[PDB]
Design a protein around this ligand. Structure first.
Ligand SMILES: *O[C@H]1O[C@H](CO)[C@@H](O)[C@H](OC(=O)C[C@H](O)CCCCCCCCCCC)[C@H]1NC(=O)C[C@H](O)CCCCCCCCCCC
Ligand code: AU7
Ligand code: AU7
Lengths: 565, 576
């Protein structure tokens, strides 16, 4: 029921190209016939060819075989080009549909699943569905035409032998069933090696090389034993299946011996009746496995309809702000991550007056990073109110709201393009290269850019292979600087502070934070002390706050928190 | 070039394979007998047509069905055997390669690991070593099985109708050249799509991973329009991929179809058809047809074999990489712990600013020293150097009056205990984590007291199975404040003479830190200590405090003396 209902959810995507499937379909039909017409000629070559008629061996055969193969070769080229064309069109339509849909999903959708899983949905599953269905379509028709093309030729040239094979087919069918039914370690290998490379530091001291080598020996030998097992199982099945089929066909030949049968048979008749019986062994093998591949094709497809049926983040705000030099205010905000029942943030009131930088410090796991995630509306809240310019964040459209925020973090993912186009990301045409180039030196990122071979027009290549942890940060700063966003969110938990030129990064932040609202998950001592207000978060609550005469002494946790970092 | 680069690389791998040569020898004999079953069955067509239909019922009846059944049994056995033998030889060689790679990576420099992602090494050794066997195995099976059958078929063609065979042979070279040219023209474009698919991968991965900056910076169109382009080129290249073989396959068998028709156009002419009979033509032509698949498989062996050696080389380069330099030749059992830096300067690999310069400091046995200074300096670097993770550039680091590099890394590193919050917790029992590599040397009562003296038993006694609970699974079960106490339990048990204590990454925000402070006190009563200090407790009791900035020791003294002095140290006291 499901297996076929999914395909019918999929057919609409295919229907614009059905024009390619039928043309392929006929190309398949004529291919089976051409292969059937050559087993046909096998009788005139033997009987007529050696019934004292060199007429047939010179005329009939050498030129009809070349004729049939041209037809055979063109039908193959055509069906191949149609299926491939249709198969290409649907995978593209689907990859594109999932790319757009997944991109519009909320961050809750990305938390559950791996990024590679969602990427597998686009790269492989989308291709496996058309692969499994195309082959399904080919086998149903191509070998469905051959099987009837061959069965006719069988009975016509000798009804006696054919009906002896058919009566045996039920028993053979049941026999191939019982044997085809008799048709973790890899995870341990990857783990045993990964946690070795993880603890290489701890393996050198304590001298664990020995216990690690023999831990691996076990794990590597166990997967080798599982590896041989699967092939061994697979190996034996077909030899038996061939044996079974050979028995029945042998019995059919012991039948041709009887004088009533042999008299009807010539040298050619039997040669084609057994050549066509043998030609039936591949179509039968294909036609029995075809619904198993259609299943796996549609199971991968309902996976993607599960994704496509998922709902994109809700953007019902109908309010637009050109630019907001203004404060962000939390009004008794309480938040709980979906799937968790203990609020990450309890009753919280926080004010970030315009132009001022509020550095919030907190324990590594606390909901300090949850605060900067709520302002950008990665998640909607359960109770309370967050006001930007005295109006709820949910009042605004999400595009306008996020135009006011700029994110800066080491882990800011850098996309595959020029340095310059990363800095002017999604606004390349807006900013002149002079505007770009200035933002680069104002971020102290130029010190390493000119070292690059083409400098600013050098392209970050192969998924970001060239840049270092510290380098990305100064490009993230240049991106926010150039865009000049009213609200600055600065992630310093992921910063990787120990760098070759940290003083360069620090002054950049100095320039960026200035005359600009800034909300920083701070780990650095310098960005902390030269910040307008400090805010401590303990679990879901704010324990104590303080300015500059309060920075001298805090009532709550600051003394122990500062002492640790 | 590549037939040489592959063949010299193969002669590198044969040492790994030769211990299983017996498996190869057997597999091949079966493959031989496998190809003869197919050759001997096509011969059965001649007596069937000539005698069985030359008015004799014995041939078709009694034995003809028996023999074919027998031949199939032989085919099935030769099949299964060769398959099992190859799958056995491969499994071994694969496993062996892994143990060689694994063993070699464990002994690599620390620079090799901080620089390379852990994954890329892990993926290659599991994937490549399997490809080296798959490609090599398939190559062997072809040269033997199909190389045997072409012989078997060539002979049978010459016995039955010595004449027809030669016409095929004289046609062979031009048919061969005809086929090779057609083949080289079209089908060699797998990489063209690999590039295009890579761009589908990159764009999709960039969008999915960097999903949060796309939303903030509003690059949905720039990402969409980019995936619209690349996905189409991927689509197009997929078709150019099939069109390669959709065009090349029908052309090639047409070329071979001509050559056979000309052999069949001679079958009509009188000189040779007279001697021959209807039963010999069937076995001669079917043999020529049976020759087509073997000839296809063989001429594609180099492509298969060279590919396998192209992945075996990537495993050989990693093996050729230089391992940790280790020429000490000196072994020390329970060093005293008299560590002294003399004129040490050092720059991390690839950087151009030394992490340390003209460092001179002395750490006498049984006494602690605290290294405090601006975060991001080389105090961490100092700790790294005593374990030989990195060799200094200039100067010398002495352990009991001898340069560390004089010592065996094994002996040198058994002297050093490391305590920090970022210790690795191997997924295994708590007891076996406390006695990591010495489960055989330390009794249970020995392990029990080490955890007790580390003040860790409160959170161990709360475990599911207590001390035999399995911590690990990459460490979820243990908090940071609890990692230290396990790290401390390791050091108490082994009782190493030189302690490296890192509170930098440690968390003083722990419900039980007075218990962590008591464990630390008991730990360092005995031995030399080198603290990257960040706690009031340790700098309070430390024997010497050295202030480090920019890889230079600018002030050395006791906590009180430096406060009487009240210079740079007092500034830090005011700052923290
Ligand atoms: O698709 C190819 O690979 C698969 C994987 O094994 C093969 O099964 C497949 O072969 C079959 O599909 C062939 C089919 O089972 C039998 C029908 C084709 C014709 C068989 C011979 C007829 C005798 C004609 C006498 C006049 C593979 N495709 C090849 O095997 C295709 C096959 O070789 C067709 C090309 C044959 C060339 C014809 C030359 C005739 C010369 C006559 C002189 C006596
Ligand atoms: C007597 C025999 O009747 C079956 C019936 C069902 C089968 N269903 C599947 C398979 C193969 C399965 C596989 O390869 O997994 C076979 C054998 C022909 C291979 C089957 C043979 C047979 C042979 Cl022998 C050769 C040609 C035709 C038939 C029957 C008339 C259909
Ligand atoms: C006359 C003709 O001589 C070649 C020579 C080299 C070949 N080398 C490769 C291939 C196939 C390549 C592929 O499929 O990519 C073929 C065709 C017979 C298949 C080749 C045919 C021929 C045919 Cl016709 C049939 C059987 C034997 C031969 C040769 C005389 C031994």
């Amino acid at each position: 029921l499901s297996t076929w209902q999914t395909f019918r959810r999929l057919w609409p995507t295919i229907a614009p190209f059905k024009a390619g499937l039928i043309v392929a379909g006929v190309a398949l039909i004529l291919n089976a016939a051409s292969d059937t017409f050559m087993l046909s000629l096998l009788k005139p070559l033997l009987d007529d060819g050696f019934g004292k008629t060199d007429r047939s061996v010179l005329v009939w055969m050498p030129l009809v075989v070349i004729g049939l193969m041209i037809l055979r070769g063109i039908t193959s080229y055509v069906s191949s080009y149609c299926i491939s064309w249709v198969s290409g069109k649907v995978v593209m339509t689907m990859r594109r549909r999932l790319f757009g849909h997944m991109m519009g999903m909320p961050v809750s959708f990305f938390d559950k699943q791996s990024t590679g899983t969602l990427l597998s949905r686009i790269t492989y599953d989308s291709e496996q569905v058309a692969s499994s269905s195309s082959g399904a379509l080919i086998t149903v028709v191509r070998e469905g035409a051959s099987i009837i093309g061959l069965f006719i030729m069988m009975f016509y040239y000798s009804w006696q032998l054919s009906i002896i094979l058919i009566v045996l087919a039920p028993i053979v069918s049941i026999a191939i069933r019982v044997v085809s039914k008799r048709f973790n370690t890899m995870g341990q290998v990857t783990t045993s090696a990964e946690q070795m490379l993880k603890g290489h530091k701890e393996v050198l001291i304590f001298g664990g090389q020995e216990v690690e080598t023999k831990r691996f020996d076990k794990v590597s030998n166990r997967m080798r034993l599982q590896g041989m097992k699967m092939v061994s199982a697979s190996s034996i099945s077909d030899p038996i299946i061939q044996l079974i089929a050979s028995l029945a066909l042998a019995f059919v030949l012991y039948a041709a011996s009887f004088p009533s049968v042999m008299d009807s048979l010539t040298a050619g008749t039997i040669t084609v009746v057994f050549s066509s019986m043998i030609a039936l062994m591949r179509p039968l093998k294909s036609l029995t496995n075809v619904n198993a591949q259609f299943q796996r094709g549609m199971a991968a497809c309902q996976t993607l309809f599960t994704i496509l049926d998922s709902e994109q983040e809700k953007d019902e705000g109908k309010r637009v702000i050109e630019r907001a030099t203004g404060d962000v205010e939390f009004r008794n905000v309480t938040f709980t991550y979906p799937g968790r029942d203990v609020p990450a943030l309890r009753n919280i009131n926080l004010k970030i007056p315009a132009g001022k930088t509020v550095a919030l410090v907190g324990r590594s796991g606390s909901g300090k990073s949850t605060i900067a995630s709520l302002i950008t509306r990665f998640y909607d809240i359960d109770e309370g109110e967050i006001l930007m310019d005295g109006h709820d964040l949910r009042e605004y459209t999400l595009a306008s709201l996020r135009n006011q925020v700029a994110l800066v973090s080491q882990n800011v993912h850098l996309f595959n393009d020029t340095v310059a186009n990363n800095i002017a990301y999604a606004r390349t045409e807006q900013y002149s290269r002079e505007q770009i180039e200035e933002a680069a030196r104002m971020a102290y990122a130029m010190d390493f850019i000119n070292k690059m071979d083409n400098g600013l027009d050098t392209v970050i290549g192969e998924n970001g292979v060239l840049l270092s942890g510290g380098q990305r940060q100064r490009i993230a700063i240049a991106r926010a600087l150039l865009r000049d966003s009213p609200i600055l969110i600065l992630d310093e938990a992921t910063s990787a502070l120990d760098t070759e030129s940290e003083r360069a990064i620090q002054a950049a932040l100095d320039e960026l934070q200035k005359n600009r609202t800034s909300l920083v998950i701070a780990h650095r001592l310098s960005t902390i002390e030269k910040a307008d207000e400090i805010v401590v978060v303990e679990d879901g609550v704010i324990v104590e706050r303080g300015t500059h005469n309060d920075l001298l002494e805090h009532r709550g946790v600051y003394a122990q928190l500062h002492k640790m970092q």
